Amino acid sequence: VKVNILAECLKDLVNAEKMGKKQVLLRPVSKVVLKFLRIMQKNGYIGEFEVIDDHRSKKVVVELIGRINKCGVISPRYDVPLADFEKWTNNILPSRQFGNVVLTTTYGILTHEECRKRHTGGKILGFFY
Amino acid sequence: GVGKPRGIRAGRKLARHRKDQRWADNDFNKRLLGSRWRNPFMGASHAKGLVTEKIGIESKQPNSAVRKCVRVLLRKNSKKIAAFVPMDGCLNFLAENDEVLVAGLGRQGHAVGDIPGVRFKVVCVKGISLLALFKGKKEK
Amino acid sequence: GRMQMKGKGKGISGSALPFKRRSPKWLHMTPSTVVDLSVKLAKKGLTPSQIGVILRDQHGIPQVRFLTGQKILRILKKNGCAPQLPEDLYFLIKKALSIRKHLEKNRKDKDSKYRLILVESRIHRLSRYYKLNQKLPPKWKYNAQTASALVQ
RNA sequence: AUGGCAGUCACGGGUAACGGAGAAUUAGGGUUCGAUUCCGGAGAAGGAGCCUGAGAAACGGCUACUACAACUACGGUUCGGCAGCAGGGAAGAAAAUUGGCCAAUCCUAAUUCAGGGAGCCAGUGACAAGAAAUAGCAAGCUGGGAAACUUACGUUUCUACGGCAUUGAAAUGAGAACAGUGUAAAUCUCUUAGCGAGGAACAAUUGGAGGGCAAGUCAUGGUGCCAGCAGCCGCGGUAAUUCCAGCUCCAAUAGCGUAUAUUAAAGUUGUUGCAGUUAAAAAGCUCGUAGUUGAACUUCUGUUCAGGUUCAUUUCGAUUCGUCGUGUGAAACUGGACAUACGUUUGCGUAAACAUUUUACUGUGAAAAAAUUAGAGUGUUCCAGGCAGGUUUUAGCCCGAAUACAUUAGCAUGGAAUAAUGGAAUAGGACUAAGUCCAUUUUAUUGGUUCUUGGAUUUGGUAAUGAUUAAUAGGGACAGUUGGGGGCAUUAGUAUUUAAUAGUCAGAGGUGAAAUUCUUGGAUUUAUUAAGGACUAACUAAUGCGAAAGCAUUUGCCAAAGAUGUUUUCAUUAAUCAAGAACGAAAGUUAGGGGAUCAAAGACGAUCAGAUACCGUCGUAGUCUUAACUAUAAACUAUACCGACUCGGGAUCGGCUGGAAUAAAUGUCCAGUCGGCACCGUAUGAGAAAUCAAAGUCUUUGGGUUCUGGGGGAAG
RNA sequence: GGAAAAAUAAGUAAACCCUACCAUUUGGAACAACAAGAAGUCGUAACAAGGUAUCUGUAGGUGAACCUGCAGAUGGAUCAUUA
Ligand SMILES: [Mg+2]
Ligand SMILES: [Mg+2]
Ligand SMILES: [Mg+2]
Ligand SMILES: [Mg+2]
Ligand SMILES: [Mg+2]
Ligand SMILES: [Mg+2]
Ligand SMILES: [Mg+2]
Ligand SMILES: [Mg+2]
Ligand SMILES: [Mg+2]
Ligand SMILES: [Mg+2]
Ligand SMILES: [Mg+2]
Ligand SMILES: [Mg+2]
Ligand SMILES: [Mg+2]
Ligand SMILES: [Mg+2]
Ligand SMILES: [Mg+2]
Ligand SMILES: [Mg+2]
Ligand SMILES: [Mg+2]
Ligand SMILES: [Mg+2]
Ligand SMILES: [Mg+2]
Ligand SMILES: [Mg+2]
Ligand SMILES: [Mg+2]
Ligand SMILES: [Mg+2]
Ligand SMILES: [Mg+2]
Ligand SMILES: [Mg+2]
Ligand SMILES: [Mg+2]
Ligand SMILES: [Mg+2]
Ligand SMILES: [Mg+2]
Ligand SMILES: [Mg+2]
Ligand SMILES: [Mg+2]
Ligand SMILES: [Mg+2]
Ligand SMILES: [Mg+2]
Ligand SMILES: [Mg+2]
Ligand SMILES: [Mg+2]
Ligand SMILES: [Mg+2]
Ligand SMILES: [Mg+2]
């Protein structure tokens, strides 16, 4: 039974980066998966990606180079007040020097950094480094 | 998988599950039901008692010697207790029916070394220390 | 995947809708004519599904909703011929009853007793749905004796 | 009247439980305590009951009882109630003086002046905390280092530093005192005269030298598995690195051992974060309610303006020990603006009203107890800490007593994501016009008409009238199949046992040998039949079906099932699962049947030292069957279920799709593919390994959900 | 008119009995273990094909381990023979 489409797509992704694969077919997909990809791409990890419209959910091909050391989802999507940021960046990320924890906020989906600059927080999605 | 719920409404099941499994941890168990209070010391650190018997106890294998001991009647409990008498010829500092101060052997309820099953040691005789007496600081 | 078969139930039976949503080019039937045929078939006491099959094999109508815009049941509803109890539940109860029938006579048949348990299980499980979604009267229950007189 | 509460744990137990403020530990998350300074609450030996008051169930008030304390001339009495202070007794392992004052702090009162075991002062005080002596500097003799020189040793220096049962005087507190400070007085401190240091004194201990664990490479003495050591491993039995001692050395050090509870160690309670094939651990198996968990779609986007905030630097500058200004572009914003585009309408960027379905969540803010804690300022001689201080401008002046934190729930307000929930599918739903009712503030008042307004209702008109896909999700329909799935009937087949009818004879059985057995009443043996219970051989396989247990003869009937095939239908209907249910080998139980084979018990033979065993001859219950119970197995892949994703290769069972050959088909072969059971290679994936294509995608630790384990025994 | 004793009715209700229980301790006739150790006794069940392969469920027997019946598991002493 499918729970958490972000989780499917993220794990399948990491797997293919790990196998040295040059691209990934990703199915099925959501807004959140595409915004997460738009985020990783904007941030330098994945490359160009293409969305495929089958009349239903969708498919997504992702050009990867190789950068991603890991990209995960956290489930459940916990509540992350601004106070708790320290915790999550220390627990999840490889080092202070890089890597992101992505969150949903009422201001939208953000690098935890974008959250300090937007001064908000509260819903954790996943991470990549 | 992991056989363990992850979900944000899962809180009580998680915490209850621990409140259960916690019982398999021994120190928790022994703590939680009074176990301490029922032991011959009644939870206490030391105890005073009377000496019923001076008794030799043959050591566990592979050691041979005669461990000098005493059976004491604890004044608080009126329980009978088998206690070891430390160092050398200290069994002599003891007379039958004295007041005696007794403590654990350091395993908290269990016997140490070659003395089988004996969980306690002698500390004071009448009022004085076995140490004080041994080194001959005071006299009985 | 297949419901209530744990361990190995899991496989894919076919249907795959083509990409073109527009009705096919070779098809000359007006949506109205289609609604006529489908209602004739309906009044003859057919199932929305059985109607679908008939239209597809015999009549060269691949997907009725891509022609009309209305799915088959909705058409039946508007045009007033309605299958009072949903075809869905209808068959499940027909079945549970055929099992009742065979089982009253062979009382030593254990597999069929277990199969019955499964089918009734599904029936209740469907009842809840059709009830919360207002497709079934709120006090409606499946019992042996109640459902046996229930149009099945 | 028949309700109220309960798996979202009621009700009831337990607490060596008064609740907080807080305390000990703490990478983070936690764990464990809070009798005890502050705030609540409760009680005055136990219960109850009162008086009087503004306030009391008071208890340093009364009445009674239960249990006690003090007097008694015995008849009576008590201003009899330590969980106030001090002090006794008792209990215990465990805790101080029957002291001095109202000077300070505050309280009470007819009150400036009186009272106060509140409080303060002193005593006891290795609870606990802070600072800190137990010796310092040289000489001379040296160890050593180092250079240089000297070719081999001598000399000269000592940014090394050491060492002296030797010499030298200086330095100073512990001690002890005149005085002065301080006090209600007394003590102590602080300041200080006269005094107070050369060696067993003005002398530190408590634990240790095998490992963990710092320290013996004592040819040390004693003891010889004794006495004893040892948290654990172990040491000791005549050469002890472990006992008893001596020397030396080590570790903490005015402290240091030991016992017990608790904290880290513990990823050995795991949310972060553990394990469950074989180390303890997946429930025999399905259904399923609570619970937990849930597929994708909706103002995407582009263009322009401004404000900062960042960035970069072949733009520069100014000055300076680095900021500032400025470029220019580049970002993510934030906010305007137009684009079918986060709203009307009104009064002066801000209010309201209207409209926007609710919330979780998140950002602010209000409300917030001090002491704590974090922390600014400040030299209590440092420091613990305190809340003070700093200055000759002195009938003064300067400056402080911050700030953060204050979790949950209430409150206020900003919010676009995410998550839940909503809205128009029997629609007068929405807007608008025109009617009908029911109310209706104002028009100083009641009455009719009206007006407004605000509800309901009828009908025309306007609008794009209103139903997202259709999950390689799930349910259902249907079509050709497939199966040792199930239930009824049927039906065969030899076989064992027995009988009949024929034959023939002396031995059959059984064993390692044998003996019990059977045999002339003719066994074993042979032929033909028949009876009666079981059982389905061979084909039979790393093949099939069933939820598991389990299921194998023919045919007929009855209901059921997967996979495949679908340009069929429904449209989230699903996953897992405490409750609660259906099954569930064998053995066993109850009531009837049946009884051929085997066959627990039993009877015997043999074997053996003994066999109450393995072997043999018998044989009951059982084995089979109806109705019922029973619920268990190494019920085993010792491997939970749903879902993704990660290698390669043939083959196999069931569908389907093409293609090819023939003797033209329910058969072959070939190539696809979906689903099964597996196998063979291989992993730069996993593991303690055996091994594992899952037992992989795990410290780079989180897809969903039940269950189980926490050293061994005791003990299922 | 005020008012003490004494009485009165209903209530608050301490204490003491009887019935039936719960909690925390505790006395106790009679039963009565378990773990550890080794130079006691009888035999040798298990480890090797432990000399009858073990082991699970069950049932019966029985100085003692154990033995036997039925169904099961290799954790087996077999990953394996149609002609
Ligand atoms: Mg422990
Ligand atoms: Mg200790
Ligand atoms: Mg030992
Ligand atoms: Mg000493
Ligand atoms: Mg599937
Ligand atoms: Mg507490
Ligand atoms: Mg108080
Ligand atoms: Mg209050
Ligand atoms: Mg007192
Ligand atoms: Mg006074
Ligand atoms: Mg004092
Ligand atoms: Mg101190
Ligand atoms: Mg003086
Ligand atoms: Mg001296
Ligand atoms: Mg010692
Ligand atoms: Mg020696
Ligand atoms: Mg020594
Ligand atoms: Mg085992
Ligand atoms: Mg969703
Ligand atoms: Mg607009
Ligand atoms: Mg026959
Ligand atoms: Mg027969
Ligand atoms: Mg077959
Ligand atoms: Mg019978
Ligand atoms: Mg013989
Ligand atoms: Mg026989
Ligand atoms: Mg073909
Ligand atoms: Mg592991
Ligand atoms: Mg490896
Ligand atoms: Mg393999
Ligand atoms: Mg994990
Ligand atoms: Mg009683
Ligand atoms: Mg024993
Ligand atoms: Mg023995
Ligand atoms: Mg038995």
Residues of C in contact with A55 (CB under 8 A): 17, 19, 21
Residues of A in contact with C20 (CB under 8 A): none
| C-alpha of A66 from chain center | 16
What angle is formed at CA A38 by the lines to CA A36 and CA A44, rounded to 5 degrees?
105
What angle is formed at CA B8 by the lines to CA B5 and CA B12, rounded to 5 degrees?
65
User: What residue has token string 């009647």?
Assistant: B73
Residue C29 burial by CB count (10 A; 0-12/13-18/19+): exposed, middle or buried? middle
* DSSP 8-state code for residue A98: B
Q: Please name the nucleotide lying closest to B42, CA to C1'.
A: D16
Query: What letter represents residue B87's amino acid?
Result: M
Phi and psi of C121, rounded to 5°?
A: -50, -50
- B24 vs chain A: nearest CA distance in angstroms? 29
* DSSP 8-state code for residue B75: T
Angstrom distance (rounded) from CA B73 to CA B12 = 49
Radius of gyration of chain C (CA): 19
Angstrom distance (rounded) from CA B125 to CA B95 = 9
Contact A115, A103 (CB under 8 A): yes
List the single residue in A with minimal CA-CA distance to C18. A55
Taking phi first (over 0 means left), then psi (-120 to 50 degrees means alpha), and beta for anything else, what does residue C121 get?
alpha
Touching chains, B (3+ CB pairs < 8 A)? A
Radius of gyration of chain B (CA): 22
User: Number of C-alpha atoms within 13 angstroms, CB side, residue A32?
Assistant: 18
Contacts 24+ apart (CB under 8 A), A112-116: A112/A85, A112/A88, A115/A82, A115/A85, A116/A82, A116/A85
- Laid out side by side, the sheet with A59-63 consists of A23-26, A59-63, A49-52
Paired tokens of A57: 């959910």
CB atoms within 10 A of CB C30: 10
Among B27, B77, B76, B82, smallest CA distance to B51 is for B82
